[PDB]
Amino acid sequence: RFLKVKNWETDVVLTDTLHLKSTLETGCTEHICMGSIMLPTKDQLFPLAKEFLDQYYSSIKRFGSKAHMDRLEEVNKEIESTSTYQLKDTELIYGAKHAWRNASRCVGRIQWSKLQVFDARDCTTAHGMFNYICNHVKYATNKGNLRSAITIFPQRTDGKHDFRVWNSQLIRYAGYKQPDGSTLGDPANVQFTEICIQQGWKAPRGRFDVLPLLLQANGNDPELFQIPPELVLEVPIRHPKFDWFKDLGLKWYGLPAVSNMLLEIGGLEFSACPFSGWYMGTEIGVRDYCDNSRYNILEEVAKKMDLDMRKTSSLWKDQALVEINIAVLYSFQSDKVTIVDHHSATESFIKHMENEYRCRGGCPADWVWIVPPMSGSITPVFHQEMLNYRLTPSFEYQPDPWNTHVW
Amino acid sequence: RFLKVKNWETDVVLTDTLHLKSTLETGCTEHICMGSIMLPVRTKDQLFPLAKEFLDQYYSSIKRFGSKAHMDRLEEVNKEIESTSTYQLKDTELIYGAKHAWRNASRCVGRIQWSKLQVFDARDCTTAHGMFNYICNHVKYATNKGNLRSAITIFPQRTDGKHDFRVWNSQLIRYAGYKQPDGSTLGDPANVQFTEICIQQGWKAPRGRFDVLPLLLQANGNDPELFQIPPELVLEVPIRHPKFDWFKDLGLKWYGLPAVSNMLLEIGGLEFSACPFSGWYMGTEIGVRDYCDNSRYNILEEVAKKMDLDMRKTSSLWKDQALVEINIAVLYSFQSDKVTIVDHHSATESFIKHMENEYRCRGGCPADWVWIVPPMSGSITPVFHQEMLNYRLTPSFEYQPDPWNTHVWKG
Ligand code: HEM
Ligand code: HEM
Ligand SMILES: Cc1cc(N)nc(CCc2cc(F)cc(CC[C@@H]3C[C@H](F)CN3C)c2)c1
Numbered sequence: 001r002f003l004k005v006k007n008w009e010t011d012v013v014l015t016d017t018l019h020l021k022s023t024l025e026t027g028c029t030e031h032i033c034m035g036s037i038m039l040p041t042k043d044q045l046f047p048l049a050k051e052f053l054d055q056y057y058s059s060i061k062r063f064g065s066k067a068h069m070d071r072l073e074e075v076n077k078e079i080e081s082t083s084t085y086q087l088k089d090t091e092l093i094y095g096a097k098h099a100w101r102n103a104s105r106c107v108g109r110i111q112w113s114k115l116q117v118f119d120a121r122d123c124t125t126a127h128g129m130f131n132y133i134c135n136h137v138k139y140a141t142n143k144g145n146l147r148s149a150i151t152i153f154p155q156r157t158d159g160k161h162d163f164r165v166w167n168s169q170l171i172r173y174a175g176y177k178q179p180d181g182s183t184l185g186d187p188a189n190v191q192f193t194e195i196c197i198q199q200g201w202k203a204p205r206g207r208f209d210v211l212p213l214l215l216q217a218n219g220n221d222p223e224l225f226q227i228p229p230e231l232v233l234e235v236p237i238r239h240p241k242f243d244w245f246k247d248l249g250l251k252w253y254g255l256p257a258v259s260n261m262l263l264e265i266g267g268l269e270f271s272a273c274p275f276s277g278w279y280m281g282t283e284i285g286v287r288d289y290c291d292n293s294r295y296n297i298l299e300e301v302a303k304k305m306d307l308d309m310r311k312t313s314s315l316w317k318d319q320a321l322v323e324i325n326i327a328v329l330y331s332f333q334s335d336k337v338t339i340v341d342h343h344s345a346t347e348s349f350i351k352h353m354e355n356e357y358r359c360r361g362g363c364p365a366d367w368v369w370i371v372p373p374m375s376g377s378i379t380p381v382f383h384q385e386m387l388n389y390r391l392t393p394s395f396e397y398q399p400d401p402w403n404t405h406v407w
Numbered sequence: 408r409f410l411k412v413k414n415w416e417t418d419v420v421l422t423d424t425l426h427l428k429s430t431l432e433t434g435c436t437e438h439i440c441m442g443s444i445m446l447p448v449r450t451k452d453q454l455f456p457l458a459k460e461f462l463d464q465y466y467s468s469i470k471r472f473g474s475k476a477h478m479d480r481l482e483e484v485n486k487e488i489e490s491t492s493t494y495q496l497k498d499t500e501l502i503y504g505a506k507h508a509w510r511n512a513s514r515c516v517g518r519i520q521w522s523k524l525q526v527f528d529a530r531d532c533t534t535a536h537g538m539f540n541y542i543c544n545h546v547k548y549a550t551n552k553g554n555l556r557s558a559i560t561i562f563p564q565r566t567d568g569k570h571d572f573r574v575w576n577s578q579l580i581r582y583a584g585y586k587q588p589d590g591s592t593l594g595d596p597a598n599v600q601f602t603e604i605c606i607q608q609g610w611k612a613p614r615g616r617f618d619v620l621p622l623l624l625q626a627n628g629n630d631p632e633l634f635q636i637p638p639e640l641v642l643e644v645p646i647r648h649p650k651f652d653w654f655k656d657l658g659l660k661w662y663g664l665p666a667v668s669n670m671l672l673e674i675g676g677l678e679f680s681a682c683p684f685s686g687w688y689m690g691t692e693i694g695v696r697d698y699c700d701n702s703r704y705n706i707l708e709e710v711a712k713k714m715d716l717d718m719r720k721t722s723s724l725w726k727d728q729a730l731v732e733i734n735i736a737v738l739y740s741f742q743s744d745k746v747t748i749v750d751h752h753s754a755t756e757s758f759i760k761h762m763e764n765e766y767r768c769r770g771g772c773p774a775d776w777v778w779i780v781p782p783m784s785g786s787i788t789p790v791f792h793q794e795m796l797n798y799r800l801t802p803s804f805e806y807q808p809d810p811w812n813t814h815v816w817k818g
């Protein structure tokens with residue numbers, strides 16, 4: 001019950017005890033493992049707050065102090081009267097850093113403690129949300145020297161006054177279904193690109209059209225805002241060996257900024273909490289460009305390479321996939337925009353695991369998501385056993401707003 | 408209670424009811440998932456329910472559930488257990504059980520072929536020489552001059568655990584590995600410990616980089632004995648590359664027949680501790696793992712050197728570049744010598760068809776995503792985007808401890 005994880009490339013064995021702190025459920029049972037499934041009142045609130053505050057005052061080596069019990073009583077009092085409570089700034093920063101730290105699917109967690117936390121709990125309107133988000137984008141982009149950041153909008157009250165960012169990421173390319181057949185732009189964003197136009201957006205109907213922001217303050221109807229183009233750093237995609245690569249007309253944005261998740265701290269639900277870091281190269285080159293349900297450019301790259309596309313066993317998809325991902329890294333590095341290759345990021349994560357087992361006793365990790373989508377077994381995480389369990393504070397998925405919002 | 412899995416590339420959703428017939432445990436709990444963990448003595452008490460459960464399955468599949476043949480076989484198995492503490496499978500039951508052990512192997516991407524297994528009954532075998540003969544015949548049959556055929560050979564079942572039949576090799580055909588005094592390894596680093604046992608048991612090692620290991624065979628619980636597989640039975644493919652003429656000068660070769668020999672087959676509560684089985688290779692087993700794992704032949708360096716890649720920073724993806732060429736070479740060499748092989752795109756697409764068929768005619772298909780997804784180019788194969796439910800059905804193939812750790816030595 002004090003479990004161990006073996007690395008099969010190095011025979012290193014770590015002993016996990018943090019998992020016994022786990023609270024939420026995995027979706028698995030003793031009879032079935034769901035490890036590859038994408039998505040599985042006053043009374044409940046105070047224990048949630050007590051648990052959070054308890055781990056908070058332990059982190060500052062003040063467990064069982066006057067300040068501890070005072071804050072416990074203080075929050076206890078506020079919950080009994082107000083039926084919720086407000087986090088101290090110090091608790092808010094800690095809660096957010098640990099939500100990232102606890103994100104078992106995230107390979108970039110070695111950087112968890114350097115997060116820049118922007119308190120936007122004083123926000124009241126979508127224009128205000130826009131302003132906070134513009135400031136976030138500029139701070140995080142930092143002229144290509146990217147910096148991690150989260151901006152936290154007011155917490156849920158009764159579920160009728162929810163703050164929500166309707167975009168899945170702050171920066172995303174539009175996608176338009178075609179009269180003849182398939183999709184122009186990004187197919188993953190077709191419904192959202194629809195709802196923007198269907199809410200008022202004027203689409204330039206290109207391939208790499210930056211979507212507008214669709215912001216919902218206090219449960220009101222959402223509003224469209226265009227992010228100033230000078231704040232959207234983009235990288236033209238070229239190849240260091242293939243001069244015809246520019247001709248493909250590819251580019252990507254520099255800032256990955258997830259905006260549709262829910263941040264849970266001490267029982268409190270922050271439904272609008274956009275956070276950003278920097279890209280791992282394969283997120284763009286393997287998934288964004290080469291997924292069949294996305295930009296799906298493999299055929300054309302292989303064609304331009306004059307590879308034998310007659311049989312799958314010539315490995316022409318594999319050959320193109322590598323070249324595409326070399327170009328993405330070359331392009332970002334050339335333009336001095338932060339990016340990490342999957343070899344560096346997974347090595348970093350092994351070192352982060354070793355740190356967490358050492359200074360914390362564990363590290364929840366989701367192998368299905370930590371292993372990169374290309375060249376999996378030549379990366380050290382492939383041979384690393386990992387235990388997956390849910391700690392809190394946490395980032396959680398939430399329903400898409402348009403399915404919910406009393407419009 | 409029904410369960411759904413979604414393919415996120417195609418939005419195809421499937422409904423699993425077969426997980427209801429799940430008996431064994433996964434290792435997971437509601438509070439921890441052990442999905443990435445590699446590998447996480449039976450009395451008459453619990454044996455008849457395990458037999459009854461198996462025989463119910465067997466007669467259901469031949470559409471004879473509740474027949475007189477079914478009830479008489481239950482009763483005959485009953486008395487045989489209480490009188491002898493074990494029981495013997497009929498030939499039909501052995502074939503059914505072993506095919507279904509393969510069918511239930513949740514980590515096996517090649518299961519579309521499960522119904523075509525050739526089953527060799529070796530339950531009359533009694534000595535290590537008899538085992539060697541059966542194994543030679545298996546290799547000849549399965550190799551079929553390069554037109555590989557799946558097969559399994561089944562030696563006598565466990566009795567009191569003190570008389571096990573075991574094949575001490577992890578695979579019937581494997582290359583030796585030799586630890587040098589300077590710290591380096593010659594041959595296959597994965598086989599250094601087994602190679603040392605063989606040398607201790609009297610094997611004269613040629614000490615090359617591709618020495619076929621001898622068979623080390625244990626019958627009825629006696630000390631194991633050494634036999635050399637006749638070289639003309641061991642089909643090997645020199646590896647060359649279709650564009651790189653220098654690739655042949657690396658001196659690489661691999662054997663054609665993948666044949667796992669250290670697993671336990673469980674049917675109706677009976678334990679078959681020696682059940683070597685064989686199929687054909689997916690190219691990545693050789694080109695990604697066998698050659699490019701840091702803990703195997705690890706040729707990425709020299710291939711990248713001969714390709715004159717930018718090897719300084721990892722962000723040039725020279726490692727990913729060399730891996731693809733090596734895997735082109737393995738596929739080209741096998742197809743050119745007409746030795747059966749399947750690429751990882753074909754195999755995973757076939758498996759998706761298999762799985763959808765299993766959901767439709769069987770109510771599910773237990774699948775271990777961590778093992779099904781190929782070790783290169785994961786997300787450009789259809790299994791990456793496929794949700795999968797993992798659970799344990801019997802008959803099954805199980806891991807067992809290495810025999811040199813448990814065996815009581817006669818001398
Ligand atoms: C700074 C560099 C970062 C890198 C390289 C990185 C990388 C990744 C990758 C590759 C994934 C896999 C998901 C996918 O493939 O779409 C992921 C998931 C995730 N990341 Fe990180 N990330 C970074 C920063 C952050 C930050 C700053 C946060 C939060 C403050 C965060 C939170 C998460 C969460 C919650 C998930 C899981 C989503 C889920 O459960 O499905 N990441 N990350
Ligand atoms: C016919 C072509 C076959 C192919 C291409 C194939 C391929 C594979 C692959 C790639 C794996 C993953 C394990 C690894 O990478 O080391 C695997 C596992 C497995 N295969 Fe298949 N296989 C084939 C035939 C068979 C046969 C004939 C059997 C048994 C009769 C079998 C039983 C298994 C089992 C039990 C596992 C699970 C290993 C474990 O639990 O660790 N396979 N196979
Ligand atoms: C901050 C950051 C840094 C970085 N390097 N990368 C990212 C993007 C990774 C990601 C994180 C997340 F918290 C949720 C999603 C949504 C995943 C989507 C949603 C759907 F369910 C299937 N996935 C395609 C994606 C973010």
Ligand SMILES: Cc1cc(N)nc(CCc2cc(F)cc(CC[C@@H]3C[C@H](F)CN3C)c2)c1
Nearest residue numbers: 517665666667670684685686687688689692
């Ligand atoms: C029949 C067949 C066809 C095919 N195409 N391939 C294989 C080999 C794959 C494999 C299958 C198996 F049933 C057990 C193992 C044992 C796993 C060992 C242990 C360690 F993890 C490294 N593996 C080599 C490996 C077999």
Ligand SMILES: C[C@H](O)[C@H](O)[C@H]1CNc2nc(N)[nH]c(=O)c2N1
Nearest residue numbers: 382383384385443444445777778
């Ligand atoms: C830690 C991890 O479970 C281990 O490295 C597994 C992962 N998936 C695998 N998948 C296959 N096909 N073969 C393997 O050896 C492994 N190794």
Ligand SMILES: C[C@H](O)[C@H](O)[C@H]1CNc2nc(N)[nH]c(=O)c2N1
Nearest residue numbers: 036037038368369791792793794
């Ligand atoms: C079905 C499967 O769970 C799904 O395709 C997952 C697999 N692993 C993943 N891993 C990462 N990093 N990102 C993903 O979107 C997915 N998708």
Ligand SMILES: [Zn+2]
Nearest residue numbers: 028033435440
């Ligand atoms: Zn699980």
